RNA sequence: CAACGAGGAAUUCCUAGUAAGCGCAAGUCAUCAGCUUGCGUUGAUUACGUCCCUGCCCUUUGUACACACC
């Protein structure tokens, strides 16, 4: 089969992520969906769209949504970009050659921050699962995993090798000793969530849910448990919503610091922090009226040391920000908003006055977007493309360059079409209005106010284009002719119910209209004849399509299935269940009975109309796919969605006993090696100190598991089971019995792990010598005789030591019970 | 329901089965008898050579075996099986007609040996209920409900098709595979005593030569 | 005497005789112990 | 958590008793008991058993409930016996009797201590095969 | 060696809203894991027959022959098609 | 101037009156005589252990009441 693929994607400038700024104002790296695009603020042309080397839709593209980019981060000097995605992976790229250097999956959910540390070679990553991982770049390895938070990492701040401090989506801020990787000090920052974190070395600043911004003093050289990070006071903001990014700078040329708190909605609150001279010379002024009350007033600090500034607003909802500064009169702040647009503002400040009633944007990159979801897409013969929006941003992109060359202002527009000669656009809006535009001249040929009484929903041209059909939610359809380039309403068919889709056949033959009452009706255009009524869909029914032979129709709806109907008798053929949310649109190919259907669950699907298989399951969008349009000839198809994206699609085993035996042999070999080393040390300290042994290096597995040999043998002796212990001790020969006795003799000198394993040592040792008693009493060596005596003394001393307190506790507890009885029985 | 000479130990106790050949068996009958002893569980095979049937029956019913399957051949091709239930119970003796065995065809692996499920298709008469009881009290009572081998005794006009299948239950249905010997057996005689005598009263035996023979089933 | 269940719902006492408190135990051991008593409550 | 990491078992013990974290209480008592066997009237270190000596009625009733259901093991029973012993030798016996609830605990854990006394006494009994083997090894010449 | 059930579960995990792939996979595993409708001999130096299919065609052949003779049995006419 | 002097690779079955040798009768409503089923006579070798391999199965709270073990 000649399958499909994706040629190019566009329409997005700023998506659901952050932005990093690079100096030359300068350029900006930001996120499109799953690929990062670089822009020069000066002009705004797309100078780079760094993307994955595999086209989404190819043979090896995997059967899920692609990983949406969620955090940009940049290493400036060594020229790296660490980007992180919504499944958890982190791709690190060199920006010179634009290839992937590092893949760092690691996490389990989407990631929320990156940070390079010690400028190169170390990257710390926090994610929507509460872990925070340190990575080395010279080893390609997750070094450490700091794991004590509970919801989702909202920010952190690190210095090199000793202290990190994170704050998460519970109420908690935590300080981490990066030598031991244990959390040191935990506080409850804000009572709900904790969304912000910034720090200029003395003071730390956090924000939570609603306007309560908390100043903290971190004293890194503290020694008390609670008190490495103390809280110094709160203050308020003007926004009652989630402040969710705070960031600081030190402008040079005197020395000064500024921080911003961006908000949820539309607003960045900027602040100047003042200096120690005006701290000292402002203390007395609130220390006037002359001291318990004055001490309470001096303790109740935030408004003192912090100074609000020019509160920068924007048109839309704010997603991310970052700035640069010179002179303290060029606080130059780039800002990516949610409805895709970046904006370069810059506030001046003459070091006492901010010199403006409201700040000024110096640049704005917004041309290649829409600010809303594209409710209707369309195409030319093959050259141009039509995107219809809610703000009014009709845009005429072109296929061969992916640039909007022409744009207008219409309104809440939901359907549109071209006109068959090209260079002319019809459109209907969500109120009772229709509109006409072109390509060479300006916007409005004419609008028709009161084109319909209520919301228009779907229009369609005839194949010659002279006559179009508009169906609207005022329970009417209307017909319009083109008189000479103006619209002529002549007839109107009022139904009983809100018509919400129209279509004609591609050979002027049928008019199929989809009502809200779960059905469609097929009429003859030449008679308004009411040929057919197709019924049985069971929810209100979206897009129709008529085939090229005018024999076979499709019918999509919110019932998550598309129905194929034969139009000769109105008989159904299939009722195939696709698309687990809602099929928004469905369109045939030009010459074939194959068709496409794009749906409200971020997927388009390629089907055939003969076997009714699914030919292909294309998976490049991230959210609700609102429209798709097929080429008139050739058959490449564009699809446009809710994530502001527009994309093109073209054609192509030991056991117990022997485990204990090998553990006993290596353990006792290490033990008597160290004892020979100690005898060598005593002889070379008691004789002429001219020589000694060189070094017994400790065993590989013993230093690998970090155990003394008594502990190593003790835990494998623990790890054999009680059912095969009498077999594990019976398998081993008498030489291993003798070194087992050496092991017991050494282990009852370390009286810690003697007393924690007394009945195990007793059971094993007594079975061993009870089973091997005949040979043991025939061995002739005073070393083993002294060994048995030493084991006997220490073992019986431990056992009588534990039964002493057992008997003490018996007599004491029954005395307690008996004196309670003789008190009040 | 369970009838009058099986009701004492219907589901109380597991059975115990001997599977044995006629006399000096051929090799395909020995393969067949191994297939029958690992068709139904808690069955063992006994090498009949120079065994008298009275003292074989007496040794079985004082060792405590529940029932006996004696297999008869014809030049490899097995032709009969007699099931004798030992606590002075019934003998149902059958002829075997279309026998295809896995030792003949294919090294397809090993069997499953789980307590199987049992399908009985249209044993409608009281003789059908009788032969159902005698055929299923040589199986283990109460298997697990996710046991993945089933066997089937399906009546097809007095010719019990006997098969064995393994199964998984997939997303769109159930996928079956055929293990073990397929038969069509047919009962030619029941009688109410054990195998030793042939002086026992007959509950049923087919009348081949009556003129209304081929008019009815379980005649 | 024998070790029964816990007397309040802020802790559990296993039959062993050792006890965990809900707040004190880690979330990995809370998943492990939920799975364990789910099996013990499934058999 | 910081005390349990860095050592320091006495203030760790009283914080585990205040928070009522019973597995951590067993760990701090087991670790302090093991290091008490290691180093060298007093059974824990002196600061910790003074910290046991100065706790009040409801704290020692929950401590003895913990000792009660640790004593049902034959493994975790030594820690329970050392804690019962230091309570007995650092508190007043009339106070311990007249605390409301301290008979439904000590009657629960008298027979378990008797069971363990029988078991450890039989271990001492069958510990004399070493002595028999030594008298044979000395008869060897 | 290993069970036919274990190999069948492995074959289902191997094969895994398309329809014809499932028709093909189901027919493939059925005619693979049905060994009693082929016949295999032992090569003394192997599927050698298809018994049920040969039986089905040999008896359908004589079934239509028997119905043809029963149709012929008491006829006396016949069209004479000389075309 | 054809075959053949105990039958290759592989493969199947088998543990005591058993494998195997030997003959003699019957012919029991299905099956069988190109044979089937009985009946006696003679009667062993080697395992009778083990989960190491190949598989199949079971359990993973000890519950059922002490003691003991865990």
UniProtKB/Swiss-Prot annotation, chain A:
Claim: RNA-binding is one of the keywords in the record: no
Keyword set, alphabetical order: Nucleus, Repeat, Ribonucleoprotein, Ribosome biogenesis, rRNA processing, WD repeat
InterPro entries, A to Z: G-protein_beta_WD-40_rep (IPR020472), SSU_processome_Utp12 (IPR007148), TBC1_cilium_biogenesis (IPR051570), WD40/YVTN_repeat-like_dom_sf (IPR015943), WD40_repeat_CS (IPR019775), WD40_repeat_dom_sf (IPR036322), WD40_rpt (IPR001680)
Biological process (GO), any one: endonucleolytic cleavage in ITS1 to separate SSU-rRNA from 5.8S rRNA and LSU-rRNA from tricistronic rRNA transcript (SSU-rRNA, 5.8S rRNA, LSU-rRNA)
Chief place where the protein resides: nucleus
Gene Ontology MF term list: snoRNA binding; U3 snoRNA binding
Gene3D superfamilies named among the record's database cross-references: YVTN repeat-like/Quinoprotein amine dehydrogenase
GO cellular component, one term: 90S preribosome
Family annotation (CDD domains): WD40
Any one Pfam family match given in the protein's UniProt record, by short name: Beta-prop_WDR3_1st
Domain of life: Eukaryota
Subcellular location: Nucleus, Nucleolus
WD repeats: 64-94, 106-136, 148-177, 189-217, 369-398, 408-438, 451-481, 536-566, 578-608, 620-650
Additional note from the record: Present with 9620 molecules/cell in log phase SD medium.
Family statement: Belongs to the WD repeat WDR3/UTP12 family.
Function: Involved in nucleolar processing of pre-18S ribosomal RNA.
Protein name: U3 small nucleolar RNA-associated protein 12
Gene designation: DIP2
Curated annotation (Swiss-Prot), chain B:
GO cellular component annotations of the record: 90S preribosome; Mpp10 complex; nucleolus; nucleoplasm; small-subunit processome
GO biological process: maturation of SSU-rRNA; ribosomal small subunit biogenesis; rRNA processing
Impact upon substituting residue 182 to A: Loss of RNA binding
Designated name of the protein: U3 small nucleolar ribonucleoprotein protein IMP4
Lineage of the species this protein comes from: Eukaryota, Fungi, Dikarya, Ascomycota, Saccharomycotina
Species name: Saccharomyces cerevisiae (strain ATCC 204508 / S288c)
Localization annotation: Nucleus, Nucleolus
Annotated Brix domain residues: 15-196
Protein function: Required for the early cleavages at sites A0, A1 and A2 during 18S ribosomal pre-RNA processing.
Keyword list, A-Z: Nucleus, Ribonucleoprotein, Ribosome biogenesis, rRNA processing
Location, primary (coarse class): nucleus
Subunit field text: Component of a heterotrimeric complex containing IMP3, IMP4 and MPP10. Interacts with MPP10. Component of the ribosomal small subunit (SSU) processome composed of at least 40 protein subunits and snoRNA U3.
Residues of the full protein shown: 72 to 290 of 290
A Gene Ontology molecular function term of the record: snoRNA binding
Impact upon substituting residue 48 to A: No effect on RNA binding
UniProtKB/Swiss-Prot annotation, chain D:
WD repeats by residue range: 1-36
Subcellular location: Nucleus, Nucleolus
Quaternary structure note: Interacts with snoRNA U3. Interacts with MPP10. Component of the ribosomal small subunit (SSU) processome composed of at least 40 protein subunits and snoRNA U3.
General remark: Present with 8070 molecules/cell in log phase SD medium.
Function according to Swiss-Prot or TrEMBL: Involved in nucleolar processing of pre-18S ribosomal RNA.
Name of the protein this chain belongs to: U3 small nucleolar RNA-associated protein 13
Residue numbers of the full-length protein present here: 670 to 817 of 817
Swiss-Prot record, chain E:
Superkingdom in the source lineage: Eukaryota
Regions of compositional bias (Basic and acidic residues) in chain numbering: 17-22
Subcellular location: Nucleus, Nucleolus
Region (Disordered): 41-62
Similarity annotation: Belongs to the NOP14 family.
Description of how the protein assembles with itself and partners: Interacts with snoRNA U3. Interacts with EMG1, MPP10 and NOC4. Component of the ribosomal small subunit (SSU) processome composed of at least 40 protein subunits and snoRNA U3.
Its job: Involved in nucleolar processing of pre-18S ribosomal RNA. Has a role in the nuclear export of 40S pre-ribosomal subunit to the cytoplasm.
Protein name: Nucleolar complex protein 14
């Amino acid at each position: 089969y000649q399958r499909f693929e994706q040629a190019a994607a566009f329409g997005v400038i700023a998506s659901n992520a952050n932005c990093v700024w690079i100096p030359a104002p300068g350029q900006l790296i930001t996120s499109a969906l799953e690929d990062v695009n670089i822009w020069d603020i000066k002009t705004g042309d797309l100078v780079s769209k760094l993307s994955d080397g595999l086209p989404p839709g190819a043979s090896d593209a995997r059967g899920a949504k692609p990983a949406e980019c969620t955090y940009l981060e940049a290493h400036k000097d060594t020229d790296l970009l660490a980007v992180g995605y919504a499944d958890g992976v982190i791709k690190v790229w060199d920006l010179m050659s634009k290839t992937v250097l590092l893949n760092f999956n690691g996490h389990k959910a989407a990631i929320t921050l990156l940070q390079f540390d010690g400028t190169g070679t170390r990257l710390i990553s926090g994610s929507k699962d509460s872990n925070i991982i340190v990575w080395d770049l010279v080893g390609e390895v997750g070094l450490y995993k700091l794991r004590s938070h509970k919801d989702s990492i909202t920010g952190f701040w690190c210095q090199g090798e000793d202290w990190l401090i994170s704050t998460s989506k519970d109420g908690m801020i935590k300080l981490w000793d990066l030598k031991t990787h244990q959390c040191i000090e935990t506080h409850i920052a804000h009572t709900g969530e904790c969304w912000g974190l910034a720090v200029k070395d003395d003071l730390l600043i956090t924000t939570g849910t609603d306007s309560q911004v908390k100043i903290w003093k971190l004293d890194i050289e503290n020694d008390k448990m609670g008190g490495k990070l103390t809280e110094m006071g709160i203050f308020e903001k003007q926004s009652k919503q989630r402040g969710l990014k705070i960031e600081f700078i030190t402008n040079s040329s005197d020395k000064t610091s500024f921080f911003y708190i961006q908000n949820a909605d539309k607003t960045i609150e900027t602040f100047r922090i003042r200096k120690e001279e005006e701290i000292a010379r402002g203390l007395k002024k609130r220390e006037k009226r002359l001291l318990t009350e004055e001490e309470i007033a001096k303790s109740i600090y935030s408004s003192f040391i912090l100074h609000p500034f020019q509160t920068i607003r924007s048109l839309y909802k704010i997603k991310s920000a970052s700035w640069t500064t010179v002179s303290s009169s060029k606080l130059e702040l780039v800002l990516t908003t949610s409805s895709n647009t970046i904006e370069y503002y810059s506030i001046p400040y003459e070091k006492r006055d901010p010199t403006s009633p409201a700040p000024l944007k110096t640049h704005t990159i917004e041309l290649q977007g829409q600010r809303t979801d594209v409710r209707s897409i369309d195409i030319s013969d093959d050259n141009k493309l039509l995107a219809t929006a809610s703000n009014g941003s009709l845009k005429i992109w072109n296929i061969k360059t992916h640039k909007c060359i022409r744009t207008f202002e219409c309104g809440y527009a939901l359907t549109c079409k071209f006109l068959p000669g090209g260079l002319l656009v019809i459109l209907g809006t969500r109120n009772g209005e229709l509109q006409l535009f072109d390509l060479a001249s300006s916007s409005l040929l004419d609008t028709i106010e009161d084109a319909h009484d209520a919301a228009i929903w779907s229009l369609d041209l005839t194949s010659d284009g002279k006559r179009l059909v508009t169906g609207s939610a005022d329970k009417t359809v209307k017909f319009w002719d083109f008189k000479v380039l103006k619209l002529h309403h002549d007839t109107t068919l009022e139904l009983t119910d809100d018509i919400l889709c129209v279509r004609v056949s591609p050979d002027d033959r049928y008019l199929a209209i989809s009502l809200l009452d779960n059905t469609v009706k097929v009429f003859f255009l030449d008679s308004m004849k009411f040929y057919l009524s197709l019924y049985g869909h069971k929810l209100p029914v979206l897009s129709i399509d008529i085939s090229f032979d005018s024999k076979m129709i499709i019918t999509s709806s919110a019932d998550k299935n598309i129905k194929i109907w034969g139009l000769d008798f109105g008989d159904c053929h299939k009722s195939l269940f696709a698309h687990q949310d809602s099929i928004m649109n469905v369109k045939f190919l030009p010459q074939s009975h194959n068709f496409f259907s794009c749906s409200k669950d971020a997927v388009v699907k390629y089907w055939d109309g003969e076997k009714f298989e699914c030919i292909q399951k294309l998976y490049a969008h991230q959210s609700e796919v609102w429209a798709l349009a097929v080429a008139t000839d050739g058959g490449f198809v564009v699809s446009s969605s809710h994530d502001h994206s527009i994309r093109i699609w073209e054609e192509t085993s030991l056991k117990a006993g022997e485990r204990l035996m090998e553990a006993l042999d290596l353990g006792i070999a290490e033990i008597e090696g160290l004892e020979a080393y100690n005898r060598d040390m005593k002889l070379w300290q008691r004789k002429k100190l001219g020589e000694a042994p060189i070094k017994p290096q400790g065993n590989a597995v013993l230093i690998a598991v970090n155990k003394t040999p008594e502990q190593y043998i003790m835990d494998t002796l623990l790890r054999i089971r009680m059912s095969q212990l009498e077999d594990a001790l019976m398998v081993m020969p008498f030489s291993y019995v003798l070194k087992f006795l050496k092991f017991i003799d050494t282990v009852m000198q370390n009286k810690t792990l003697l007393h924690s394993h007394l009945p195990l040592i007793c059971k094993n040792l007594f079975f061993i010598i009870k089973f091997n008693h005949k040979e043991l009493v025939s061995q002739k060596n005073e070393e083993l005789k002294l060994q048995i005596n030493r084991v006997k003394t220490e073992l019986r001393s431990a056992l009588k030591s534990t039964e002493d307190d057992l008997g003490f506790n018996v007599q004491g507890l029954k005395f307690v019970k008996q004196q309670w009885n003789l008190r009040h029985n | 329901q369970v009838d009058d000479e099986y009701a004492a130990t219907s589901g109380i106790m597991d059975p115990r089965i001997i599977v044995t050949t006629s006399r000096d068996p051929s090799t395909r009958l020995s393969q067949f008898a191994k297939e029958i002893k690992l068709l139904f569980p808690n069955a063992v095979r006994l090498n009949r050579g120079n065994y008298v049937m009275p003292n074989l029956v007496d040794a079985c019913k004082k060792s405590g075996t529940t029932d006996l399957v004696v297999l008869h051949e014809h030049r490899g091709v097995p032709t009969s099986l007699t099931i004798s239930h030992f606590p002075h119970g019934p003998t149902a003796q059958f002829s075997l007609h279309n026998v295809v065995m896995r030792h003949d065809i294919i090294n397809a692996g090993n069997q499953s040996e789980v307590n199987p499920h049992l399908i009985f298709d249209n044993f409608t008469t009281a003789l059908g209920k009788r032969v159902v009881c005698i055929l299923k009290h040589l199986f283990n009572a109460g298997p697990k409900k996710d046991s993945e081998r089933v066997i089937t005794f399906a009546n097809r006009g007095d010719f019990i098709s006997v098969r064995q299948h393994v199964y998984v239950r997939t997303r769109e249905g159930v996928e079956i595979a055929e293990v073990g010997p397929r038969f069509e057996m047919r009962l030619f005689e029941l009688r109410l005593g054990t195998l030793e005598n042939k002086d026992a009263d007959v509950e049923w035996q087919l009348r081949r030569f009556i003129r209304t023979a081929n008019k009815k089933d379980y005649l | 005497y024998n070790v029964g269940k816990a007397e309040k719902d802020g802790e559990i006492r296993l039959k062993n005789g050792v006890a965990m408190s809900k707040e004190e135990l880690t979330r990995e051991d809370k998943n492990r112990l939920r799975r364990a008593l789910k099996r013990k409550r499934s058999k | 958590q910081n005390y349990m990491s860095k050592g320091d078992w006495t203030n760790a013990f009283l914080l585990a008793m205040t928070l009522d974290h019973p597995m951590r209480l067993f760990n701090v008592l087991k670790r302090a008991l093991g290091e008490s066997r290691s180093r060298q009237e007093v059974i824990f270190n002196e600061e910790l058993d003074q910290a046991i000596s100065i706790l009040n009625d409801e704290q020692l009733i929950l401590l003895m409930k913990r000792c009660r259901d640790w004593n049902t093991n034959a493994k975790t029973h030594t820690i329970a016996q050392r804690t019962i012993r230091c309570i007995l030798m650092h508190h007043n016996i009339a106070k311990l009797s007249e605390i409301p609830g301290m008979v439904k605990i000590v009657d629960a854990i008298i027979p378990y201590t008797q069971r363990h006394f029988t078991r450890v006494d039989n271990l001492v009994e069958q510990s004399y095969i070493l002595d028999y083997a030594l008298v044979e090894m000395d008869k060897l010449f | 060696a290993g069970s036919q059930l274990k190999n069948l579960k492995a074959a289902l995990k191997a094969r895994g809203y398309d329809r014809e792939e499932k028709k093909k996979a189901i027919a493939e595993i059925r005619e693979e894991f049905n060994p009693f409708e082929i016949k295999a001999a032992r090569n003394k130096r192997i599927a050698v027959g298809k018994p049920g299919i040969s039986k089905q065609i040999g008896e359908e052949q004589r079934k239509r022959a028997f119905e043809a003779r029963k149709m012929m049995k008491n006829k006396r006419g016949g069209v004479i098609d000389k075309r």
